[PDB]
Structure formats: C-alpha cells, structure tokens
C-alpha cells in the first residue's frame, strides 16, 4: 500500500537483519550460552533475501533450447547425429544439462515375457484339458462339460428363456457362456444342461494357458469362415440307457483360433500329431519371465571408448576434436561408480533410466529356514460335507423305538462322523514354488535335460532353448541346505543379475510398458568426463555423436539370450539435443566468461574410475594366470583393482559391431555388476622381475596376496569363512582406512553400494563326509525320492509315486546326525579387489606416497603379476584396473575455441612414437 | 561432499554441523552435517 515497503518489511523482519543483529547484545549472548538446554533459536524471525540485480537477465532468452540435427545418418548397425551446440553471447552452458532426446520404436521380440505365470486360466489345473474331441479306432469321442441349466431342448438348441410365449433359444455364437453355471453348491438335478466343446479339428491344448481371440462383440470366440458366418454345430446327448428319446446335454461344437501365447507343454505324452485320448494328459507350464529393457543409465546406446565411432565436440571454426577417447578407458563403469559415491544408488530416476541392477538377497544366498507348518491346512467341500447318508426320524415309545413320519421327512441327509477334507502343506508349497522359480530354473545348463517329445531349439543362446530345458525340482527343493545360509556351488558362477527378481531391470522394463511393441521416448545423459560437467563459454560448437543399434548392447534381457535371433529390433526416428541455459545477467555472464578464458582458470576434470583397463584372457579351466607389464615409469601410480569376467558376457569394445556376441544380459564390464570376485586364490606381484611387492615382510605370507585358502593348517582365516587375514586387512584398509586400530563396521557414507563390506557375505554349511561316515551311499538325482508320492519325478509335471520314507538328504541334526564336515566360502559381489599402491595399504590421498617415491618416479620397472584363480569351464577374462590420473585440462581462449590437453600417468596414451 | 574446514597455511577440520542433544528439533534451527 506504501511506495517504500522497507520500513514494515524491516519491522516484521521480512527483509532486514539476522537475530544476531537486531536483538539486544545481551540476549544474543544469553541465547548462545543456553543453546544446548533452553533454545531461543526459533523464537525470532531471520530473513533471507534474494539478490535483485546482476543475477538474472531481463531480455528474451530461453531456458531450454532445442537443437535440430544438422547432419543425421542411419547406418544398419548404428546411428549418427551431428548438431550445432551454439552458445550465444553472454550465456553459459553446463554440459551436465545437455542430453539427447531420442525417439523411436523398440521391438522386444517374441521372447519377451514381463510376468511370471500365465495370463489365461491361471487358476485351472495344469493337466486340466479343454472340452475336446478326438478320434479312436473312426469314432469321434467327446470329453466336455455342461454347466448351464436351461429350460427345454429342441432341435433349435437350448431354451434360455421366453419372450411372452415364444421359446427364445440360445444364440449359438456366444451363448451358453462358459463363465455361467449353477450358483448353489448342492448338486441338484439338471435335465436340460448345455455347454461348449471344441471340435476335433481344433488342436488339443491344456486349459492352463489357452487363449482364442474373440470373433464377435459378445465375446463368443469361434473361427468365422467365408461363404462370413460362424460354423457352430450343435451336438445333442442323452442318457446311455435311454437309447422315445429326449436329449439331456447340448454341446455347441466349434473351431476356435486356439493358442498358448505365454505357456509351453512340460509333458507331451505322444509324439504323434492330431487329437487323441493321450493328449488329455499333456500338461502346460508357463514360460520363463524375460524382462527386456534398456540398460541402467542407458549403457550401450552411446559409443563410448570406441575411437572408430568417437564423438565430436569442436568449434565450427577449427573443427579439431576436443574429445580424445581411449579403448582402455571404461567411461560406462566410471559413471556407474560415480553415481554410487555422490548419491543414493538405491533410488530410481526414470529420466536417465537410473535403476541399478540389484539381485534378490534370498535368491543368491539361500537362507533356508524351512517352513512354519506346525498346523495342518485343510481344504473343505462346498457345503462343508458331501458324504451324508439318508436317515429317518424316530420317536421313542412309552425300551422301544418307532418311526416319526408325521412332522419330519423320512429322508434326512445327516453326516455320521467327521466331514470329508483334504490336507495341503501351504508354507512348504509357497517355499517350493519360491526355490524352483527363482533358483532351480536358473541353474547351469549342464544340470538340466531335454524334454521328451518336444521340439527344442539347437542354439543354446535362444530363449526357446532356455524356456524348454526341463530341470528336476529335486535339485533345488524345499530341503536344500536346511538351516544353512549357503549360496549353491552351482549358482556361484552364474550371474545373479540375469534374473527376473533383478529389481532394476524389473523397473526398467515396466518403465517402457508391458507390450512387445514399444514406441519409446528417452533422455540419454552424457558420460564422457571431459564434457560431462563442462561449462561451455560462448561460441559455435559442433557436437556429433554415434549411437548403437545393437539389440544385444542397447537392451538387457533377464536371461541373457541372443536378441538378434530372438527378433528384437530398435529403430531411431529422431534425436534432439537439449540444453538448459541458466538465465544469467548479460554483464554477470560477460564477467564469468572473461574470467574463465584466462589460462589460470582452466576447467580441469578427472575420470572417476581413473584407470587403465586391460582384459587378460583366461582359458577354460585354467588355474594360473600370468600377466606382464613390460617396462614403464611408474610415477603417480595409485593401485590395482581386479575382477574376473566372462568372455561370453564382455563385448570387445572399439569394434562397432560384434557379430559373434550372442548375449544380452548384464554386462559386468560396463555396469559394475561384478560377481566372480570369489574365484580368486592368490596374487603374486613382482616388480622389475626380482623384487616381490610389497616385500618388507609385510604380510603373514609376505611374498604374495593370499585371497582365500582351502588348506588352512596354520589358522589364518577371517570372518568364519576362507578369506585370509592378510587379504581382509588389505581390503578394509583400501576402502575404509580400517584395520590397524581394530576392525569395526565402517560408516554408512563410506560403505557405498559397490564397496567391499556392503557386499562381503561369509557363509558356511556342513555336508556329509564320504570318508568318516560309515553308511554313506552316493545317491544321484535319479534315485532321490524325498516327497516321493506327492511330487512329480524329475519334472515340474504332475505327481507320481507312492508315499514312502525318504533317503535324501542325510540328517545333520538329532541323535542320528551323520559325520559332517564344514565347507566355508564367501561371496562378495559388485566390487573390485582393490590393492592400493601405498606403503601402508591406506588412502592418505589420491596421489599415494609410493607414487611420489623417487624409486618409481626416476626409473622404469617391469611388472609381472601372477594371478591364480578357481577353474571355470568357460572362457573367462581378467579385468585389472591399473589406477592412473586420467585428467583433462580444458582451455577456451577465444569465442568458439575449445582446446583440451589430456594426460594420464603412468599409463599415458601418448609418447614420442606418436 | 567434504566435511567443514577452518583455515588458520594449515587446513583444520571445523566442528560445525555435528549432532547434539537439543530440546528443539535441529533441522528447523541448523543444517546438520
């Protein structure tokens, strides 16, 4: 109301002084003394005031810009989009606000199943057939059902009701509906029933998983044939001993377009084609759930570290590329480990598709508590009782009894004794459904076997192979390692992230949708560290980038199947570069421009991984792995970090297209989902072909880094596992500076997701001893008959057998506990075995004391590291991080000039030869 | 990202932002680091 609002903004403390300034100096001195026991802090209003001038412009200027591609290109294997990243005068652009808005259509292929179970008749039994017809030696047999109860039956069909006096009969296209039957529980008489039965030309499927498309508006499915009229014939049935004749059951025969779009047959009884009686025993099993989606943080779209497909950021005057990418850099993993350190990695950010690959901890490490099934769980009939007998009311005489038929009827359904019931163990069935769906179906393929009478694919990287390999439920049944927190030895070397409980890929698949055909709209971040946080000064810059079209790289399936064979395809419609400018004032952004063009104000960046990446191949079942770095100035060396990979699961980057890479699961090289850490025995590091590192009698075994042991005579293991005491000391000092003043649980901010202690899980179980137990008999999976007559044999099919005392496993408890031996191991996922190049294995700075040592800085030393690993029957890799200082310094001296100097030490990418 | 620091050069860790017992909730008063 007042032209100068300041005298009453200062009075009410809207704009003015802090409470340290407007209060009396004795009250401020009082409130600081009593602050811990009598708070006067919130009793006084403290104003905060935004700056008016020289912060935000008043001119017409956009926050977000839209950059059309100047020069786009669609290869059959990649996509290239070239832009003009024009930063105008008195404007600054942080390249973190820049991203690519990619549109297109994603085809997930026929092998995508985003849900466990089936969509159609899931409550049906798996052996329950449809109402089907067949031929025997030829007569056409009918096995059907007539649930509807009408009024009368003539040759026109069943009478569903009247319209006045005219009998209005059932419309044969959709009536009688297969969902409508009796509503009462007691089996009253139906003299005029009807139902629907599939014809003999319709192929016989089980009810579980059966779908036919509806061919009219009223939902009545049936093949329309041109003459466009449905052929639904009526089939009248009567009593066997009745053959006047009145028909009792009318079955509307029909041809449907029947299909099982999300199930498969787990038991084919007959190899022959055509309908038969034996095909009522075929049993349907749901297909394995396959989550096909873009990777976490959009790994695999963008060509990083492929210098043949290297992107461009250069000014349009010079067009000299300021991006100098390298093949022994890992820009994807440097961005996966960066987001763990500066943020909560458990959270989900849908815009960058930031949903971390995370297995379920019950599935990886089986913590088998048994089942809480002390009470029997019974099912009961519809009216509580079915086997009542007929009795007659009897009144006493005036010993003596006589019939009372005046008030009570002579027929009374009265049950004598307990009612009928059947018993099911519910908690065991929920736990046996858990272990089979999550663990037994994810076993290695050497454990499984081919189904009988089912055509299976020959390519093992096809989903049709992985779906149909039938696995015995007795391998992982509800009694495996009872009371042992023990991951299976079969399941250690199997990727836990290729699973349908991978909650990241579970989230990233549903973020696109549930269908095969997904038109997507994605925002892909920039990960190259020199241009990831770069603040561009004004100028005209070209900004060119290569995108992948490889469906084994841009997509992630939860089984790891070859998505090129499995019909997955991606098509890019258009890509737009967006860039959000801060609306800075044109004199402030001219001062900031002029300050940041000095050669002392150069923006310098560092890759978060900061490592040289060397994949050393390991042959199949090869225990010893010798590597060799020939000769180098080892100045500014930080340390090592290593993890075994798989050659099947790791693509050779630098190649723009690998036609022999038949895998679309989690790539541990790119996302940080490392899981083969436990397969290391020892590391022997010897500098200069003579000097063992660290030397100095540092370790209890001073010549090498013993990571784990089988033979432990001298007693050097930690954590009730087989990890040694030297190696647990190093790994707690490398990550946490913990170990010289006692081992303790590190703080929650140092113990991130990809760290050691978050993921180190020690385990122990007891198995039977074949050397001490006297009555030991090796019983294979063919002859183990626990749950003998209540469980299907070697199959998820129907039960078979008799009730009988089990023979497997041997009891480890009780008075008859067998002679048992302890097997110890550990699993430590998601992490890299860090060995820091420090004289006390501690992090006292990023540039360590041995990297500054005059031994390694003024001389050239050889390096001969000798890894010893567990044998694996698969060609595996070895991913050693040679930790360096991958540092860029960026100079922009004039408008549109972008000069960068890259340098990493020791493993530099430029010497006098280049 | 970095704990608070005084500059007496030498570089001295500052004790501000640490947790204390307070009769009133500490988020409405201070920033707790």
């Amino acid at each position: 109301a007042t032209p100068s609002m300041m005298p009453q903004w200062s009075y009410m403390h809207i704009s003015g002084q802090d409470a340290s300034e407007y209060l009396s100096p004795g009250l401020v001195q009082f409130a600081r003394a009593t602050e811990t026991y009598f708070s006067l802090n919130n009793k006084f209003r403290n104003p905060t005031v935004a700056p008016t001038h020289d912060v935000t412009t008043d001119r017409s200027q956009r926050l977000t810009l839209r950059f059309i591609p100047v020069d786009r290109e669609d290869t059959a294997y990649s996509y290239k989009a070239r832009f003009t990243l024009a930063v105008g005068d008195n404007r600054v652009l942080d390249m973190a606000s820049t991203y690519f808005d990619i549109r297109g259509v994603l085809d997930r292929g026929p092998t995508f199943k985003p849900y466990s179970g089936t969509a159609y008749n899931a409550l049906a039994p798996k052996g329950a057939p449809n109402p089907c017809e067949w031929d025997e030696a030829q007569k056409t047999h009918v096995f059907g059902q007539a649930p509807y109860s009408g009024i009368n039956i003539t040759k026109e069909g069943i009478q569903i009701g009247v319209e006045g006096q005219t009998p209005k009969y059932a419309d044969k296209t959709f009536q009688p509906e297969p969902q409508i039957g009796e509503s009462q529980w007691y089996e009253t008489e139906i003299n005029h029933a009807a139902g629907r039965v599939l014809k003999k030309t319709t192929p016989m499927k089980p009810c579980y998983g059966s779908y036919a498309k509806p061919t009219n508006e009223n939902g009545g499915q049936g093949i329309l044939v041109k003459q466009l009229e449905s052929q639904v014939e009526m089939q009248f049935f009567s009593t066997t001993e009745a053959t006047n004749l009145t028909p009792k059951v009318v079955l509307y025969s029909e041809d449907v377009d029947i299909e099982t779009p999300d199930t498969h047959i787990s038991y084919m009884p007959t190899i022959k084609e055509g309908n038969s009686r034996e095909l009522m025993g075929q049993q349907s099993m749901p297909n394995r759930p396959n989550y096909i989606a873009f990777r976490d943080n959009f790994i695999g779209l963008m060509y990083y570290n492929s210098t043949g497909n290297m992107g461009v950021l250069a000014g349009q005057a010079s067009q000299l590329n300021a991006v100098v990418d390298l093949q022994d850099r890992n820009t994807e993993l440097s961005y996966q480990l960066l987001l763990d350190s500066i943020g909560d990695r458990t959270r989900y950010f849908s815009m960058w598709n930031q949903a971390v690959d995370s297995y379920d901890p019950d599935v990886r490490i089986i913590e088998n508590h048994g089942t809480e099934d002390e009470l029997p769980n019974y099912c009961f009939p519809l009216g509580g009782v079915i086997n009542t007998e007929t009795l007659t009311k009897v009144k006493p005489k005036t010993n003596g009894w006589e019939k009372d038929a005046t008030e009570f009827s002579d027929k009374n359904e009265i049950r004598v004794g307990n009612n009928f019931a059947m018993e099911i163990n519910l908690n065991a069935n929920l736990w046996r459904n858990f272990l089979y769906s999550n663990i037994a179906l994810y076993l290695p393929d050497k454990l499984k076997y081919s189904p009988s009478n089912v055509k299976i694919s020959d390519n093992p990287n096809t989903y049709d192979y992985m779906n149909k390999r039938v696995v015995a439920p007795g391998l992982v049944d509800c009694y495996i390692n009872l009371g042992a927190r023990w991951s299976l030895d079969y399941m250690d070397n199997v990727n836990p992230f290729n699973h349908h409980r991978n909650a990241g890929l579970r989230y990233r698949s549903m973020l696109l949708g549930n269908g095969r055909y997904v038109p997507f709209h994605i925002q892909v971040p920039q990960k190259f560290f020199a241009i990831k946080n770069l603040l561009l000064l004004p100028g005209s810059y070209t900004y060119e980038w290569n995108f992948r079209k490889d469906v084994n790289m841009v997509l992630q399936s939860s089984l790891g199947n070859d998505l090129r064979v499995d019909g997955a395809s991606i098509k890019f419609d258009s890509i737009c570069l967006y860039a959000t400018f801060f609306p800075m004032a044109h004199n402030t952004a001219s001062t900031l421009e002029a300050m940041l063009r000095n050669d002392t104000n150069d923006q310098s960046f560092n890759d978060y991984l900061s490592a040289a990446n060397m994949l050393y191949p390991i042959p199949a079942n090869a225990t010893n792995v010798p590597i060799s770095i020939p000769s180098r100035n080892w100045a500014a060396f930080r340390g090592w970090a290593f993890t075994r990979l798989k050659t099947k699961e790791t693509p050779s980057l630098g190649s723009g297209y690998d036609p022999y890479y038949t895998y679309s699961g989690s790539i541990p090289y790119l996302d940080g989902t490392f899981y083969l850490n436990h397969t290391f025995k020892k590391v022997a590091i010897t500098f200069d072909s003579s000097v063992s590192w660290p030397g100095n009698d540092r370790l209890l075994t001073p010549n090498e880094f013993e990571i784990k042991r089988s033979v432990d005579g001298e007693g050097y293991n930690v954590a009730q596992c087989n990890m040694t005491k030297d190696w647990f000391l190093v790994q707690m000092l490398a990550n946490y500076n913990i170990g010289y003043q006692g081992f303790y649980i590190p703080e929650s901010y140092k113990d991130r997701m990809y760290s050691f202690f978050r993921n180190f899980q020690p385990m122990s179980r007891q198995v039977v001893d074949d050397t001490k137990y006297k009555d030991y008999q090796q019983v294979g999976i063919l002859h183990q008959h626990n749950n003998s007559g209540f469980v299907g044999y070697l199959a998820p099919t129907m039960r078979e057998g008799q009730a009988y005392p089990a023979n497997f496993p041997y009891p480890l408890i009780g008075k008859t506990a067998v002679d048992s031996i302890t097997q110890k191991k550990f699993l430590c996922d998601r992490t890299l075995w860090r060995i820091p190049f420090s004289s006390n294995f501690m992090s006292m700075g990023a540039l360590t004391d041995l990297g500054q040592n005059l031994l390694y800085a003024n001389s050239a030393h050889a390096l001969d590291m000798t890894f010893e690993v567990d044998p694996m029957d698969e060609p595996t890799l070895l991913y050693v991080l040679f930790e360096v200082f991958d540092v860029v310094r960026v100079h922009r001296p004039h408008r549109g000039v972008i000069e960068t100097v890259y340098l990493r030490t020791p493993f530099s990418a430029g010497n006098a030869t280049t | 990202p970095r704990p608070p620091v005084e500059e007496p050069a030498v570089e001295t860790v500052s004790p501000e932002g640490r947790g204390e017992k307070r009769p009133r909730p500490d988020r409405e008063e201070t920033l707790v680091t």
């Binding site: 409470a19 340290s20 401020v28 006067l40 919130n42 209003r45 104003p47 | 008063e29």
Partner: peptide
C-alpha cells in the same frame, strides 16, 4: 543459532 533462516514453504 540466531543466524539460521526461518523455515517457510518453498523458500
């Protein structure tokens, strides 16, 4: 202390 600014909705 007394220098901490007052809690308001959105600023």
């Amino acid at each position: 202390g007394l220098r901490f600014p007052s809690k308001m909705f959105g600023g």
